Every structure is written in structure tokens, then in C-alpha cells.
Amino acid sequence: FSVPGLYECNRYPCIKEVECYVSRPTEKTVFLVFMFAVSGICVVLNLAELNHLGW
Amino acid sequence: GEWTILERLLEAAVQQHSTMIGRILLTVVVIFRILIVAIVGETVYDDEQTMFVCNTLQPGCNQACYDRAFPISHIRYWVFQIIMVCTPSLCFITYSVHQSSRFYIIQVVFRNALEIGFLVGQYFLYGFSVPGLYECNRYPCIKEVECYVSRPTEKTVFLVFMFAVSGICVVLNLAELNHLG
Amino acid sequence: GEWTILERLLEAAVQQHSTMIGRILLTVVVIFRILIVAIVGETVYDDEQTMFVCNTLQPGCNQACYDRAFPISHIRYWVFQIIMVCTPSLCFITYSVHQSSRFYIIQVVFRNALEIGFLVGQYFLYGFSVPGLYECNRYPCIKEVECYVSRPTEKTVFLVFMFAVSGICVVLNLAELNHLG
Amino acid sequence: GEWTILERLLEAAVQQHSTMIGRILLTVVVIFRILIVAIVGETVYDDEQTMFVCNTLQPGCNQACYDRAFPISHIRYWVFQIIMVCTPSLCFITYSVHQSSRFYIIQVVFRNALEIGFLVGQYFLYGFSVPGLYECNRYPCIKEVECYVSRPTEKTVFLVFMFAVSGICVVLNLAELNHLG
Amino acid sequence: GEWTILERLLEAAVQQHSTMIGRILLTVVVIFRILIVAIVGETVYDDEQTMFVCNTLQPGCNQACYDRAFPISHIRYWVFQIIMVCTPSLCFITYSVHQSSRFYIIQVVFRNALEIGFLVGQYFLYGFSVPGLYECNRYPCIKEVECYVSRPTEKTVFLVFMFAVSGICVVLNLAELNHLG
Ligand SMILES: CCCCCCCCCCC(CCCCCCCCCC)(CO[C@@H]1O[C@H](CO)[C@@H](O[C@H]2O[C@H](CO)[C@@H](O)[C@H](O)[C@H]2O)[C@H](O)[C@H]1O)CO[C@@H]1O[C@H](CO)[C@@H](O[C@H]2O[C@H](CO)[C@@H](O)[C@H](O)[C@H]2O)[C@H](O)[C@H]1O
Ligand SMILES: CCCCCCCCCCC(CCCCCCCCCC)(CO[C@@H]1O[C@H](CO)[C@@H](O[C@H]2O[C@H](CO)[C@@H](O)[C@H](O)[C@H]2O)[C@H](O)[C@H]1O)CO[C@@H]1O[C@H](CO)[C@@H](O[C@H]2O[C@H](CO)[C@@H](O)[C@H](O)[C@H]2O)[C@H](O)[C@H]1O
Ligand SMILES: CCCCCCCCCCC(CCCCCCCCCC)(CO[C@@H]1O[C@H](CO)[C@@H](O[C@H]2O[C@H](CO)[C@@H](O)[C@H](O)[C@H]2O)[C@H](O)[C@H]1O)CO[C@@H]1O[C@H](CO)[C@@H](O[C@H]2O[C@H](CO)[C@@H](O)[C@H](O)[C@H]2O)[C@H](O)[C@H]1O
Ligand SMILES: CCCCCCCCCCC(CCCCCCCCCC)(CO[C@@H]1O[C@H](CO)[C@@H](O[C@H]2O[C@H](CO)[C@@H](O)[C@H](O)[C@H]2O)[C@H](O)[C@H]1O)CO[C@@H]1O[C@H](CO)[C@@H](O[C@H]2O[C@H](CO)[C@@H](O)[C@H](O)[C@H]2O)[C@H](O)[C@H]1O
């Protein structure tokens, strides 16, 4: 649901849990939430149609 | 430095009545302790903060991790050791003109104490080895970092040699003590 | 530097009538104060402006903050201290040739004054500690920045040792005073 | 440098008939002027061109602006001052053998002149202060630039101290001049 | 360094009864070994860690590969050699002040042993040459790297010359041994 501004990584070759930063961590959150909402609306409409039509 | 002042002071301080063991002790402290520190010493620890590098971009991690790893360089410790060990024999210059054996006893016991204390402090500060890796977790460094050391094999030898000499001198001091009552 | 001139001048200045306490004071000032500064001193404060770094890109923020943090290095303060404390004993070289006890009193009181003043100035300038962080708010630097220090644990020891020696010498001077009337 | 040659030469030049005031003047010039320059001096002005930086990319602005700000370092001015002030007393080595009080008068006059001239030159060259900012408008720099200085508080002290010593010596010289006629 | 202390100690240690071969040995150790190390030596090995570079970006490969290639610089090995070889003759002062031939035998034996041991150690540590390439496979370096050396032709000469001198001295010591029984 969100995108933070700090990630701690411990992968090779990185030595022992270094820190890494991020770019534009606030537009991506908005875009996430927006698309989630749209997809939910589509889900609801399809469900209502199926019910109205189905047995 | 200026090691000639100490030379002249000593040359004026050794005109004192002693015994075989005191002369042996003076010989040992003069050859294996001074002539090594005066000549071979200053050039090993001259590039200790310049070739010490950590793996990070944070300004202020190298200084902190150095000060945390080597709070005091060995060479200064040994210089102080030499001076404080030779003092009780320098006080004779002051005690002489006053009159113009008891003092022997006092000197001996104080030398025992100083030597033992310095050996113990040496074991508790540095140890027996100097490795080529350190892990540092002091502000501003981020949670831990690896820091690398310079010439870590040419200092271990010094450490061991000095430990041996100190042990020998402690033994000789105790021997001179038991020869007293 | 050239510390032999001082050696010869002193060796010619100590041919004076003194008492136990004056000789003890001379011994202390000679061993625990000079021989340390001459030998162990110059190499600690040699990389003080080169390893001092602040967190900024502004040109001229390191020089200002340095000058604001360490306006005067410790070693030069101590050198000046030594010279000004030894002067009254040097004036004898002149008084004697002029005459070829009162002077004793004058020397004593002046030594008292100088020692006390220098100890107080030491407490008011530097303090008891040297930390590894400084906050700077002096032009050209932007309102406030952080600046880091080098070897902040090897200078605190010097500070403390010198404070102790100065205290002891003040005590001895006052003792010699009360022995006068 | 080699300050022992001067020591020996002087030690062979002071075997001359003088009075209280001449000896006081010699003492002052020897303690507060020579021992300060020999020991504390050479090390302050060692990083004067390396830590002087201007705010520009033009190659050749730092050199020009330095040469325009500090045409001559203080320490060499003071060395020259010392030598030229001690000269009239060295010429006794040459007059002695040739004779194997008039000379006294000539010495005194020339000492007066040299001391006054050097004090006035000090006033007109450097001043009473050393600031941490300079404005430079010399080719190749573009019409003006700010240039920053290193250790601007450790040199003001030297300036003031030397001004005071010079004033005292001028006073003593005039006192000796008003003692003959 | 301060090589005058050794000079005075020796000048006081050679007032001993010897024979042709001891004097020849002293001459050789004094000319071809001391005067070469005091003057020409300290300046060749001053840029040994600063001009040693490996082909990699990993921080901490140069220090490790250096410490693995040159664990100890030749010059300090030779200094130690000189001191330990001259000791048995320095130990005559104490015996002299004590008595105020057997000793000759003991000195000779110990000199034989020390010389042979140091020659063999030289063979086993460094060798007969110093090349301009090294292959390093020590952490943190990745599985291998080439590392390049500075002035690799000015040190081979020193090595060879010192090997020759040591051989000659061993020969002379054995010759003096067979002269007794
Ligand atoms: C880095 C600087 C280190 C400083 C190194 C300075 C070197 C010291 C040299 C040795 C030294 C100090 C003590 C040595 C122990 C330490 C060994 C050092 C080992 C270092 C490698 C001996 O010191 C003696 O110790 C005696 C102790 O009993 C003492 O005797 C006292 O006990 C009584 C009982 O109470 C007491 O009442 C009373 O007051 C004393 O009778 C003597 O007074 C004292 O002179 C001083 O050297 C003395 O002077 C010369 C130069 O040496 C040397 O040669 C001279 O005589 C030769 C006649 O043939 C001949 O050559 C020449 O005429 C001449 O040249 C002397 O022979 C030597 O004696
Ligand atoms: C880094 C720069 C520091 C330089 C350090 C220089 C070392 C100084 C050495 C001590 C020193 C200065 C004062 C010491 C106090 C400070 C202690 C320092 C401690 C430092 C660790 C003593 O000074 C004496 O002080 C006396 C004060 O009363 C004074 O006596 C006056 O009181 C009257 C009352 O009015 C007054 O009227 C009148 O004028 C005086 O009668 C003497 O004239 C004066 O010589 C000078 O040393 C003197 O010379 C030799 C070398 O020492 C030493 O050995 C010599 O004699 C030995 C006979 O066996 C024997 O060996 C040899 O024949 C010979 O070799 C002497 O024994 C020593 O005396
Ligand atoms: C950085 C290098 C600086 C160099 C520093 C060198 C130190 C100088 C020491 C003082 C000094 C120079 C002048 C001092 C003024 C400047 C003060 C300096 C202040 C600095 C802190 C005095 O100089 C004297 O000046 C007199 C002026 O009148 C002159 O007298 C002339 O006037 C006549 C009238 O015409 C004229 O005809 C005629 O020719 C002279 O009769 C003398 O000949 C002359 O010797 C030379 O020192 C002399 O030698 C020894 C060592 O000092 C000192 O100790 C010795 O005697 C003691 C007997 O107890 C005793 O200890 C010992 O036996 C012995 O050891 C002497 O006592 C001292 O005298
Ligand atoms: C980097 C530091 C190195 C230090 C270098 C110091 C230089 C040493 C100089 C040589 C040296 C040390 C030994 C030399 C061997 C090593 C060669 C070194 C080669 C280096 C390039 C000789 O040493 C002698 O050795 C003899 C051994 O037998 C010994 O004799 C013993 O045997 C007995 C049997 O038991 C025994 O009982 C008993 O005790 C002794 O009788 C002597 O006592 C001893 O003095 C000391 O020098 C001595 O003093 C002067 C200065 O030299 C020199 O000139 C003086 O005499 C000249 C009369 O014309 C004339 O000029 C002048 O009056 C005067 O000036 C002397 O002539 C010279 O003798």
C-alpha cells in the first residue's frame, strides 16, 4: 500500500546491512492507491453483473 | 626529538654505588629499549591515520573509528614508560647536593611498582596482536563498518619484543628485591 | 626546535643558593614538563588542520570553524608557560654580574603569580576535555553545520596530566611562601 | 635553521664593558625575542599558501592574491630584525684585535635608528590585526574575488607581542641615550 | 635518528685488548655497514607504500598485499643486525667497572652465532632479488591481482652488497675462532 524512502539491504557484495535511498516516494504511493481503487470498482461492477445474470 | 639531554642527565646520574644486578638492568634498559625506540620507531607510525580507510562515504567515520581503535599509539606509551622508569635514578642528582642507603630501598620498590603497572597496562590496552581488520559502530557510521589497517605485521613484532624485555626487567627487579631482606 | 640553548642557560642559572623545595620544584618542572613537550609533543598536533573536515561544500567553512574552535594550540601555550616560568631564574645571570636575598623574595612571588595565572587561563580557554564534535555558525558557513575532530582522546590525557603538574607546582610554591613569613 | 653559530658569536661578543641598561636590553632581546622565534615560529607559517583558497576557477588567482596580501611573511621580517639589531654588538670582535668609548656612542646611535625604523616599518606593512577575509582585484581575477585566510587568530597575538617588545626596547634605548649628554 | 650515542658508547667500548683480526672486523663493520645505512639508507625506502599500487577498485587490497609482500623493510632488519652484533662489545663496560680472558671467548662465540643466524634469516626472508611484480590472493582481493613495486633495481644492489659483507664477517669470525683451539 505504500513506498518508503529507506531500504536496508544485506545482499552480496554489500557488507553487512547497508542503507539505500529512493526517488519520488510520494507520487508512486498515489498511483498505487488510485489504480487499486479503479480495479476495485471494476470488480464490484463485474460481480453485480454476474449476480444479476447468474443462477 | 632531543635525546641528548637525557643522555647527559643519565651520565651524571649513574655515578652511584650499585651492585651487579643494577648495572645489568641499566645495560638492558639502555640497549634493548632506548636505541630501538630512538632509531627504528618514529618512521613506522608516521602513516597511521593517512593509510587507514573505511568502506563508506559518510564524512567523519574514519576519524571516529581510528580514535576508537588506537586511542594511543604504542610509541608514546613506550616513551612515557622509559621516562617514568628512569626517574628514580635521576632523583639522585637532587638528593646528593643536600648532604653536601635507605634511598636505595625506596628507589628499588618504586621501580618494581612502576614496571609491573606498565606491563599490566600494556596487556590490558593493546594485547598480543594487531590485526588487519576492525569493525566500527560509533556515530556517525551507520550501524557497522569494516575498517582496514596499515602495516599490521611490523607492529606485532615490536609488541612481542617489548613484552619480553619488560618481563626480563621485572624478573631482575624482583631478584634484586629478594637480595635485600 | 633548538632546546639546547635553554639547557646551557639553565645549567648556568642553577648555581644559586636554594632550599629543598626549590630543588624539588626544578626537578618536577624539568622531568614531567619539558622532556614530555620536547619529545612527545610536536607529532600529535601536526595533522590538526588537515584532518579537520566539515559537512558542506562552501569554500572557507573549515578555516573559520577551526580558528573558532582551536584559536591557539595547546603545545604553544605550554611552551610559553615553560619559558615565562623559567625566566625569573634566568635573571640571576644578570644580577650576579651586576653585583661583581631580596631577589629571592621577588623571584618567589613572581613565580607564584605566573603559575596561578597560567593555570586559570588554561581552565578558562580549553577546559577538561576535547570532544569529537563541534557546531559552527560563523560566516561563510550557513547558519549551522557539524565539524569533526581528529585524535580527540590523545589530547585529553595531555590536558589532564598538565593540569595535575600545574596544581602540584602551585602547591609547592605556596609551601615555599609560607616558609618565609 | 642553525641558531648555534649566532649563539657562539654572541657569547664571544658580550665580553664588553656595559652598564645595567645594556644588560637588561640584552636579556630582553634574548628571552622574549629569540627563544620565541626559534621554537614556536617556523611551524605556524608552514601552511600559509596551501590553505589559502579563493572562490573561482581561474588558474592563477590564488598565487596573485596571496602575493598581494602577504608580500612578506612576518617571521622573516622578525629574523632580519633580530640580526640587524644584534649586528652593532658583533663588530666588537673586529675592533678588539685591531686595538691589539666612542665606539659605544656609535653603537648606541645606530641601535636607536634601526629599532625605530623597524617598528615603523612594522606599523606601515602589517598593522595591528590579521583578518580572515581579503578582496582581490588583480589580474587574472575578474574584477573582484573573496579570498580566505588560515589561522587568523594565532598571528594577531604574535603581532601584538612583538609590537610590545619593540616598544619596550625603544624606551630602554632612549633611556640609555639620555644618560650621556 | 641519533647515531652519536652509539658513536660515544663504542668509542668507550674499544679500549679493550684485541688482535689484528678483531680490529679488521671492527673496521669492516664500521665503514661498509654503518656509514652506508646512516646516510644512503633512510631515503630509498621512504616512498614504499605510497607508490605501491594494485589493479583494482576494492578498498583494502593495497594494504594487505603490501603487508604480505614486504612484512618487514630491509633497513630495520639491518639496523637490528648492527645493534645485536655490536652488543657483546658494549657489554665490556660493565665487566670493567666490576673488576674495579674468558669473557673474550664468550664474546667470540656469541658473535659467531648471531652473525650466522642473521645471514640465514636474510636468505630465508628476502632472497637475492626484488622483482617489479607481485601476485596477491589475500582477502579482500578477488582471487588474484597484479601489484607493482617501486625502485626494484636500487634495492637488489643493497641486498647483494650486504650479503657479501655478512659473508666476509662470518669468514673472519671463524678465522678468529680457529686461532684459539
Ligand atoms: C644512553 C646514555 C647511557 C649512559 C652511559 C654512560 C657510560 C657509563 C660508564 C661507566 C661509569 C657509570 C656506571 C656504569 C653502569 C651502567 C652501564 C651502562 C651500559 C650502557 C651500554 C662507571 O661508574 C662508576 O660506578 C661505580 C659504582 O661503584 C662508582 O664507584 C663508587 O662506589 C663507591 C661505593 O659507595 C662510592 O662511594 C664512590 O662514589 C665510588 O667509588 C664510580 O664512582 C663510578 O664512576 C662511568 O665511567 C667511568 O669513567 C670513564 C668512562 O666510563 C671510565 O674510564 C676512565 O677510567 C679508566 C681507568 O682505566 C680509563 O679508561 C680512563 O682513566 C678513563 O676514561 C671509567 O673506568 C669509568 O669508571
Ligand atoms: C634540562 C636542563 C636542566 C639542566 C640540569 C643540570 C644538572 C645540575 C647538577 C647539580 C648542580 C645545580 C643545582 C641542582 C638543583 C636542580 C636539580 C635538577 C634536576 C633535573 C633532573 C648543583 O649546584 C650547586 O647548588 C648549590 C646550592 O647551594 C651551590 O652551592 C652554593 O651554596 C652557597 C650558599 O649561598 C653559595 O654561597 C655558594 O655559591 C655555593 O656553595 C653550588 O655552587 C652549585 O654547584 C650543578 O652540579 C654540580 O657540578 C657537577 C654536576 O652536577 C657535580 O659533580 C661534580 O662534583 C662531584 C663531587 O663529588 C663529582 O661528581 C665531580 O667532582 C664533579 O662532577 C657537582 O656535585 C654538582 O654540585
Ligand atoms: C642565546 C645566546 C646568549 C648568550 C648568553 C651567554 C651568557 C653570558 C654570561 C655572563 C657574561 C657575559 C655578559 C652578560 C650580559 C648579558 C646577559 C645574558 C642574558 C641571557 C639570559 C659576563 O660578562 C662579563 O661582563 C663584564 C662587563 O663589565 C666584563 O667585565 C669587564 O669590565 C671591565 C670594564 O672595562 C673590562 O675592562 C674588562 O674586560 C672586564 O673586567 C667581563 O669581562 C665579562 O666576563 C660571561 O660570563 C662569565 O663567565 C661565566 C659564565 O657566565 C661566569 O662564571 C664563571 O665565574 C664564576 C665566578 O663565581 C663561577 O661560576 C665560575 O668561576 C665561572 O663559571 C662568570 O661569572 C661570568 O662573568
Ligand atoms: C663510528 C664510531 C667508531 C669509533 C672509532 C673510534 C676510533 C678509535 C681510535 C683507536 C683506539 C681504539 C681501538 C681501535 C680498533 C678499531 C678501529 C676503528 C676503525 C674505524 C675506521 C686505540 O685503542 C687502543 O687499543 C689497544 C689494544 O691493545 C689498547 O691497548 C691496551 O692493550 C693492553 C693489553 O691488554 C691493555 O692491557 C691495556 O689496557 C692497553 O695497553 C689501548 O689502551 C687503546 O687505546 C683509541 O685511540 C687511541 O687514542 C687516540 C685516538 O685514536 C690516538 O692518538 C693519541 O695517541 C697518539 C700517539 O702518537 C697521538 O696521536 C696523540 O697523543 C693522541 O691523539 C691513539 O694513538 C689511540 O691509541
mmCIF file of N, CA, C and O and ligand atoms in Angstrom, chain B residues 6-7 10-11 14-18 23 26-27 30-31 34-35, chain E residues 5 9 12 15 90 93-94 96-97 100, ligand 1:
data_model
loop_
_atom_site.group_PDB
_atom_site.id
_atom_site.type_symbol
_atom_site.label_atom_id
_atom_site.label_comp_id
_atom_site.label_asym_id
_atom_site.label_seq_id
_atom_site.Cartn_x
_atom_site.Cartn_y
_atom_site.Cartn_z
ATOM 1 N N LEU B 6 68.613 13.709 27.905
ATOM 2 C CA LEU B 6 68.508 12.500 28.707
ATOM 3 C C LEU B 6 69.860 11.817 28.843
ATOM 4 O O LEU B 6 70.207 11.317 29.919
ATOM 5 N N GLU B 7 70.640 11.791 27.762
ATOM 6 C CA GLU B 7 71.954 11.163 27.812
ATOM 7 C C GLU B 7 72.834 11.820 28.863
ATOM 8 O O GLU B 7 73.451 11.139 29.688
ATOM 9 N N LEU B 10 71.543 11.247 32.491
ATOM 10 C CA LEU B 10 71.869 9.897 32.931
ATOM 11 C C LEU B 10 73.354 9.766 33.239
ATOM 12 O O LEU B 10 73.737 9.309 34.322
ATOM 13 N N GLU B 11 74.210 10.156 32.293
ATOM 14 C CA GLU B 11 75.648 10.085 32.514
ATOM 15 C C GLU B 11 76.057 10.764 33.808
ATOM 16 O O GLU B 11 77.078 10.393 34.396
ATOM 17 N N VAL B 14 74.491 8.156 36.961
ATOM 18 C CA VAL B 14 74.971 6.802 37.208
ATOM 19 C C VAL B 14 76.228 6.771 38.060
ATOM 20 O O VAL B 14 76.807 5.693 38.253
ATOM 21 N N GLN B 15 76.671 7.913 38.581
ATOM 22 C CA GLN B 15 77.817 7.940 39.480
ATOM 23 C C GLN B 15 77.368 7.577 40.887
ATOM 24 O O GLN B 15 77.622 8.314 41.844
ATOM 25 N N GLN B 16 76.705 6.432 41.014
ATOM 26 C CA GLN B 16 76.097 5.993 42.257
ATOM 27 C C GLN B 16 76.554 4.578 42.570
ATOM 28 O O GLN B 16 76.852 3.792 41.668
ATOM 29 N N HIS B 17 76.602 4.258 43.858
ATOM 30 C CA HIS B 17 77.007 2.929 44.292
ATOM 31 C C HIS B 17 75.864 1.953 44.054
ATOM 32 O O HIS B 17 74.754 2.151 44.559
ATOM 33 N N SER B 18 76.135 0.906 43.281
ATOM 34 C CA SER B 18 75.136 -0.096 42.947
ATOM 35 C C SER B 18 75.787 -1.469 43.045
ATOM 36 O O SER B 18 76.903 -1.618 43.552
ATOM 37 N N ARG B 23 73.512 -2.753 37.496
ATOM 38 C CA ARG B 23 74.236 -2.467 36.264
ATOM 39 C C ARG B 23 73.681 -3.274 35.099
ATOM 40 O O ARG B 23 73.541 -2.755 33.985
ATOM 41 N N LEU B 26 70.486 -1.590 34.034
ATOM 42 C CA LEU B 26 70.759 -0.379 33.268
ATOM 43 C C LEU B 26 71.180 -0.720 31.846
ATOM 44 O O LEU B 26 70.710 -0.107 30.882
ATOM 45 N N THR B 27 72.077 -1.696 31.699
ATOM 46 C CA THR B 27 72.501 -2.117 30.368
ATOM 47 C C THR B 27 71.306 -2.532 29.522
ATOM 48 O O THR B 27 71.165 -2.112 28.365
ATOM 49 N N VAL B 30 69.103 0.280 28.491
ATOM 50 C CA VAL B 30 69.756 1.241 27.612
ATOM 51 C C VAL B 30 69.859 0.704 26.193
ATOM 52 O O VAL B 30 69.679 1.450 25.226
ATOM 53 N N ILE B 31 70.159 -0.583 26.035
ATOM 54 C CA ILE B 31 70.384 -1.126 24.698
ATOM 55 C C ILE B 31 69.066 -1.521 24.040
ATOM 56 O O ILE B 31 68.699 -0.997 22.983
ATOM 57 N N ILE B 34 66.049 1.875 24.577
ATOM 58 C CA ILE B 34 66.212 3.229 24.061
ATOM 59 C C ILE B 34 66.651 3.208 22.602
ATOM 60 O O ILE B 34 65.976 3.766 21.730
ATOM 61 N N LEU B 35 67.787 2.570 22.313
ATOM 62 C CA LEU B 35 68.333 2.600 20.961
ATOM 63 C C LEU B 35 67.366 2.045 19.927
ATOM 64 O O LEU B 35 67.519 2.335 18.738
ATOM 65 N N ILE E 5 75.021 8.680 19.957
ATOM 66 C CA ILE E 5 75.059 7.916 21.199
ATOM 67 C C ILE E 5 75.847 6.631 20.991
ATOM 68 O O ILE E 5 76.725 6.273 21.789
ATOM 69 N N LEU E 9 79.359 5.510 22.877
ATOM 70 C CA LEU E 9 79.420 4.225 23.564
ATOM 71 C C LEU E 9 80.520 3.350 22.981
ATOM 72 O O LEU E 9 81.324 2.768 23.718
ATOM 73 N N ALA E 12 84.008 4.386 23.741
ATOM 74 C CA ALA E 12 84.365 3.977 25.092
ATOM 75 C C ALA E 12 84.480 2.465 25.246
ATOM 76 O O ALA E 12 85.053 2.002 26.238
ATOM 77 N N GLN E 15 88.345 0.346 24.067
ATOM 78 C CA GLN E 15 89.570 0.393 24.854
ATOM 79 C C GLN E 15 89.830 -0.976 25.469
ATOM 80 O O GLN E 15 90.015 -1.101 26.683
ATOM 81 N N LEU E 90 79.759 -3.925 23.647
ATOM 82 C CA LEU E 90 79.250 -2.934 24.586
ATOM 83 C C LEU E 90 79.207 -3.485 26.002
ATOM 84 O O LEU E 90 79.328 -2.724 26.968
ATOM 85 N N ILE E 93 82.004 -2.624 29.229
ATOM 86 C CA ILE E 93 81.986 -1.548 30.217
ATOM 87 C C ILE E 93 81.618 -2.096 31.590
ATOM 88 O O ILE E 93 82.255 -1.780 32.606
ATOM 89 N N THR E 94 80.557 -2.900 31.639
ATOM 90 C CA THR E 94 80.071 -3.428 32.907
ATOM 91 C C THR E 94 81.116 -4.322 33.563
ATOM 92 O O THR E 94 81.386 -4.204 34.762
ATOM 93 N N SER E 96 84.313 -4.259 33.122
ATOM 94 C CA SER E 96 85.421 -3.417 33.552
ATOM 95 C C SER E 96 85.120 -2.772 34.896
ATOM 96 O O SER E 96 85.903 -2.882 35.845
ATOM 97 N N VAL E 97 83.981 -2.085 34.995
ATOM 98 C CA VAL E 97 83.629 -1.447 36.260
ATOM 99 C C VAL E 97 83.474 -2.485 37.363
ATOM 100 O O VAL E 97 83.657 -2.177 38.546
ATOM 101 N N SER E 100 86.858 -3.540 38.929
ATOM 102 C CA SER E 100 87.476 -2.436 39.651
ATOM 103 C C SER E 100 87.142 -2.506 41.139
ATOM 104 O O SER E 100 87.760 -3.261 41.889
HETATM 105 C C1 LIG F 1 72.320 6.465 26.712
HETATM 106 C C2 LIG F 1 73.235 7.038 27.812
HETATM 107 C C3 LIG F 1 73.690 5.957 28.827
HETATM 108 C C4 LIG F 1 74.834 6.440 29.713
HETATM 109 C C5 LIG F 1 76.133 5.539 29.566
HETATM 110 C C6 LIG F 1 77.368 6.190 30.221
HETATM 111 C C7 LIG F 1 78.580 5.175 30.349
HETATM 112 C C8 LIG F 1 78.961 4.921 31.833
HETATM 113 C C9 LIG F 1 80.473 4.450 32.017
HETATM 114 C C10 LIG F 1 80.763 3.701 33.354
HETATM 115 C C11 LIG F 1 80.531 4.555 34.692
HETATM 116 C C12 LIG F 1 78.960 4.706 35.113
HETATM 117 C C13 LIG F 1 78.277 3.348 35.764
HETATM 118 C C14 LIG F 1 78.129 2.149 34.714
HETATM 119 C C15 LIG F 1 76.863 1.257 34.937
HETATM 120 C C16 LIG F 1 75.863 1.349 33.709
HETATM 121 C C17 LIG F 1 76.450 0.680 32.394
HETATM 122 C C18 LIG F 1 75.912 1.387 31.073
HETATM 123 C C19 LIG F 1 75.629 0.354 29.955
HETATM 124 C C20 LIG F 1 75.272 1.016 28.620
HETATM 125 C C21 LIG F 1 75.840 0.234 27.406
HETATM 126 C C22 LIG F 1 81.229 3.856 35.944
HETATM 127 O O1 LIG F 1 80.633 4.459 37.128
HETATM 128 C C23 LIG F 1 81.229 4.143 38.322
HETATM 129 O O2 LIG F 1 80.309 3.266 39.129
HETATM 130 C C24 LIG F 1 80.892 2.956 40.436
HETATM 131 C C25 LIG F 1 79.876 2.197 41.266
HETATM 132 O O3 LIG F 1 80.528 1.713 42.430
HETATM 133 C C26 LIG F 1 81.311 4.206 41.209
HETATM 134 O O4 LIG F 1 82.080 3.787 42.359
HETATM 135 C C27 LIG F 1 81.621 4.347 43.545
HETATM 136 O O5 LIG F 1 81.430 3.269 44.517
HETATM 137 C C28 LIG F 1 81.670 3.727 45.890
HETATM 138 C C29 LIG F 1 80.854 2.902 46.833
HETATM 139 O O6 LIG F 1 79.971 3.771 47.545
HETATM 140 C C30 LIG F 1 81.302 5.212 46.061
HETATM 141 O O7 LIG F 1 81.422 5.569 47.444
HETATM 142 C C31 LIG F 1 82.181 6.067 45.272
HETATM 143 O O8 LIG F 1 81.448 7.296 44.914
HETATM 144 C C32 LIG F 1 82.632 5.393 44.032
HETATM 145 O O9 LIG F 1 83.897 4.742 44.285
HETATM 146 C C33 LIG F 1 82.150 5.135 40.390
HETATM 147 O O10 LIG F 1 82.298 6.393 41.111
HETATM 148 C C34 LIG F 1 81.547 5.419 39.071
HETATM 149 O O11 LIG F 1 82.478 6.213 38.299
HETATM 150 C C35 LIG F 1 81.272 5.991 34.493
HETATM 151 O O12 LIG F 1 82.521 5.726 33.753
HETATM 152 C C36 LIG F 1 83.755 5.918 34.421
HETATM 153 O O13 LIG F 1 84.520 6.963 33.717
HETATM 154 C C37 LIG F 1 85.125 6.522 32.437
HETATM 155 C C38 LIG F 1 84.028 6.363 31.415
HETATM 156 O O14 LIG F 1 83.365 5.143 31.623
HETATM 157 C C39 LIG F 1 85.909 5.225 32.578
HETATM 158 O O15 LIG F 1 87.282 5.397 32.083
HETATM 159 C C40 LIG F 1 88.096 6.179 32.881
HETATM 160 O O16 LIG F 1 88.833 5.314 33.823
HETATM 161 C C41 LIG F 1 89.641 4.300 33.114
HETATM 162 C C42 LIG F 1 90.656 3.743 34.041
HETATM 163 O O17 LIG F 1 91.268 2.605 33.410
HETATM 164 C C43 LIG F 1 90.361 4.882 31.883
HETATM 165 O O18 LIG F 1 89.682 4.434 30.697
HETATM 166 C C44 LIG F 1 90.394 6.358 31.877
HETATM 167 O O19 LIG F 1 91.205 6.824 33.021
HETATM 168 C C45 LIG F 1 89.041 6.969 31.969
HETATM 169 O O20 LIG F 1 88.465 7.021 30.652
HETATM 170 C C46 LIG F 1 85.893 4.731 33.979
HETATM 171 O O21 LIG F 1 86.548 3.420 34.030
HETATM 172 C C47 LIG F 1 84.516 4.596 34.474
HETATM 173 O O22 LIG F 1 84.591 4.143 35.840
#
